[PDB]
């Protein structure tokens, strides 16, 4: 037979991959960072509070201008916010109320959303009629849509629960590339700053680094226990951080092929719903099901603050491109700006 | 001017507030079944790529049937966005004795979920007339064990089928389980669901008011 040989071949490939990592695992990030100054107690205050959503807020994204913001809710509406003056710029009603993700175009002319309807809808924001209308529906996924991130004005990457990720052409409306290789449903996604690679977390305790141009998986990272529901990319673009249901966060590197630091404590037993980084990469913010949001010293793993003030589980979390504010949504139908 | 943009924001709030009244009286029902259960014909008698929500109204009360198709087999915590529903409607084929064992497992996995706690259950034993014809000529002892009743009595078999469903709950003492032996009657199906969700809310008010 040959399946037994292939199983044997797969058995010995993993040994050589571990040995290659183990040989290069000469030290740890903690040992090198045993002589740097601690950041101290971070204190943040709720500057603004955005009211108007009628149900649980599932997704939220920041505009590149660092002033506008979009949010989604179980009610089935999309609201564009002016974070400075708490002004509702737009209010987009959706066809389906089961929407689990939303994205903002880098140029600002489009927004995207999707969910348990297995499709992604693109909305034109700058029309001559003075309204907001859907531009194109992107069908081709067999599971529910779990994440989407605009590449360009004519390109978007979507991940679904059918264990795959895809790259689309909005003008044509057809799936250009399909990324296969996962085992469980993909829950997260994170575009690189250069926008040429991306990473995805799935419900199999595995994160894979992909290549949009080539359509093939470059790297694979393991070490978690439960499903990974939050992934973010380091500002340098050479690392990323995960967050899983086992109440732990880890920092992986694309070059060392290894986990570097672990962000867990004995007083936390609930999972992580969202993960975000700071403009300089020195802080790591993560939402939790314990109704709070935690700030971690990314270079020291020491907790350094708590963003408390929400009355339910924190779902969303984002940092502006200029590093001046943090927005967090939660199941109590409120958004809060923290400075 | 920035003062004319503030009036646009306040005009949006007036439209949002007009929907707050509707969502405060909305009742969501999650519908489950199978291909032979009769979910297609059941919805045909209701005068209304993923989930097919059917918004309608009974006795000036808004209703919404979240009818997932075959997607209900998904078994992740993310898929449990239905933690805000008030009841779960389950369609079961009584005539199909062979698949009753199969239909008895998916019931066990859903109702015992840690998310669907504080949610009531409604059971609709569909095609009862076919069961009447199927029994009195075909025994159920050849398909099921631990059946001490008479296999040629409709009331004896019916009293056994419901007990098989009721014994697969490890969280019984939190919420009730209603059962109906419905058919293609086409008329009472909307009224039977109305009473079950009326008493579900009533038994939520009685604890919230400290009246019981």
């Amino acid at each position, epitope marked *: 037979s040959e399946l037994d040989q292939l199983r044997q071949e797969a058995e010995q490939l993993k040994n050589q991959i571990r040995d290659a990592r183990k040989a290069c695992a000469d030290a740890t990030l903690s040992q090198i960072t045993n002589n740097i100054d601690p950041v101290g107690r971070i204190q943040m205050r709720t500057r603004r509070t955005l009211r108007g959503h009628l149900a649980k807020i599932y997704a939220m994204h920041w505009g590149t201008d660092s002033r506008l913001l979009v949010s989604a809710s179980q009610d089935g509406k999309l609201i564009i916010w002016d974070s400075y003056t708490t*002004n509702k710029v737009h209010a987009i009603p959706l066809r389906s109320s089961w929407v689990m993700t939303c994205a903002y175009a880098p140029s600002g002319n489009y927004v995207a959303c999707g969910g348990l309807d297995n499709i992604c809808s693109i909305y034109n924001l700058k029309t001559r*009629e003075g309204n907001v209308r859907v531009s194109r529906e992107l069908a081709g996924h067999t599971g529910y849509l779990s994440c989407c991130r605009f590449l360009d004005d004519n390109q978007i990457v979507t991940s679904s629960g059918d264990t795959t990720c895809a790259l689309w052409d909005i003008e044509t409306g057809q799936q250009t590339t399909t990324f296969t290789g996962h085992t469980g449903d993909v829950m997260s996604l994170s575009l690189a700053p250069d926008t040429r690679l991306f990473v995805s977390g799935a419900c199999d305790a595995s994160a894979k680094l992909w290549d949009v141009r080539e359509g093939m998986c470059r790297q694979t990272f393991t070490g978690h226990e439960s499903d990974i529901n939050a992934i973010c990319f380091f500002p340098n673009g050479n690392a990323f951080a995960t967050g899983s249901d086992d109440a732990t966060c880890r920092l992986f590197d694309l070059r060392a092929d290894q986990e570097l630091m672990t962000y867990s404590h004995d007083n936390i037993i609930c999972g992580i719903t969202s993960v975000s980084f700071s403009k300089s990469g020195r802080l790591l913010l993560a939402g939790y099901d314990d109704f709070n949001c935690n700030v971690w010293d990314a270079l020291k793993a020491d907790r350094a603050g708590v963003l408390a003030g929400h009355d339910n589980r924190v779902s969303c979390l984002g940092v502006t491109d200029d590093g001046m504010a943090v927005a967090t949504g939660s199941w109590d139908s409120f958004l809060k700006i923290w400075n | *001017e920035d003062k*004319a943009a503030a009036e*646009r924001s306040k*005009e949006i709030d007036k439209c949002l507030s007009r929907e707050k009244t509707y969502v405060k009286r909305l009742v969501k029902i999650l519908l489950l079944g199978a291909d032979n259960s009769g979910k297609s014909t059941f919805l045909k008698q209701m005068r209304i790529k993923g989930i097919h929500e059917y918004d309608f109204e009974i006795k000036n009360v808004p209703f919404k049937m979240v009818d997932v198709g075959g997607q209900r087999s998904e078994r992740k915590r993310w898929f449990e966005c239905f933690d805000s529903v008030t009841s779960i409607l389950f369609l079961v084929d009584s005539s199909d004795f062979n698949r009753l064992t199969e239909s008895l497992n998916d019931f066990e996995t859903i109702v015992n979920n840690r998310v669907f706690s504080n949610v009531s259950i409604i059971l609709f034993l569909n095609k009862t007339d076919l069961l009447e014809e199927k029994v009195q000529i075909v025994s159920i002892k050849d398909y099921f064990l631990e059946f001490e009743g008479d296999p040629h009595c409709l009331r004896d078999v019916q009293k056994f089928l419901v007990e098989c469903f009721r014994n697969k709950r490890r969280d019984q003492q939190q919420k009730p389980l209603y059962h109906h032996f419905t058919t293609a009657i086409n008329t009472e199906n909307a009224r039977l669901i109305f009473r079950d969700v009326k008493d579900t809310i009533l038994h939520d008010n009685l604890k919230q008011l400290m009246l019981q």
Partner: single-chain antibody
Amino acid sequence: VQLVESGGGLVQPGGSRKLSCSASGFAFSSFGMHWVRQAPEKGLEWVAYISSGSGTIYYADTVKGRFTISRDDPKNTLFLQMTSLRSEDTAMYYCVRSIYYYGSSPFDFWGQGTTLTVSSSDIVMTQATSSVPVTPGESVSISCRSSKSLLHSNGNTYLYWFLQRPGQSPQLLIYRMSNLASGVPDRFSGSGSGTAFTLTISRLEAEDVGVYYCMQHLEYPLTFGAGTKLEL
């Protein structure tokens, strides 16, 4: 996409005339509309305003009391009512749509205009450029100034530029003194700091002839500068 106004005609002093404007091709319920008049040989003059939902209404100091502006959103129409028509009301009336949110471009689309003949403080916005002769293919600059500083605390400078081609309705070129309207070639640019403003054309063409106006939106008694004719 269409803004057709009608209802004008010859009238006697002291008589009443009603102006109606019909919109078709856009979400009329979310646009605040304006009335702008133009004397038979002089520049434009703002008249009235009605918000979206008819929340706030503003009038010119010369027509307050005699003029009333109302809208009928379901019928997609806008109305102007005049009761005591004097001899200074002989002009051409335009209708302008405008929407206000963060990043919008108001005054983008103007109507077609209806004529009316009668047989019988605030920022002063200046333009000492009555006539200028040009040659196609060259670069020109149009200068302007205001009594007060148009720069606001929120960083927005409210100065607009308009172009009226011979026998054509005015069109928007630059809004908020730095932003280029959609559908306008890149050769048009604007500058200025808080009091003196200039519109620059890189390469001239045959369609650049006409009269260039400008406007302020800082205080609602809106004022237009005098015309600037490109003689060519």
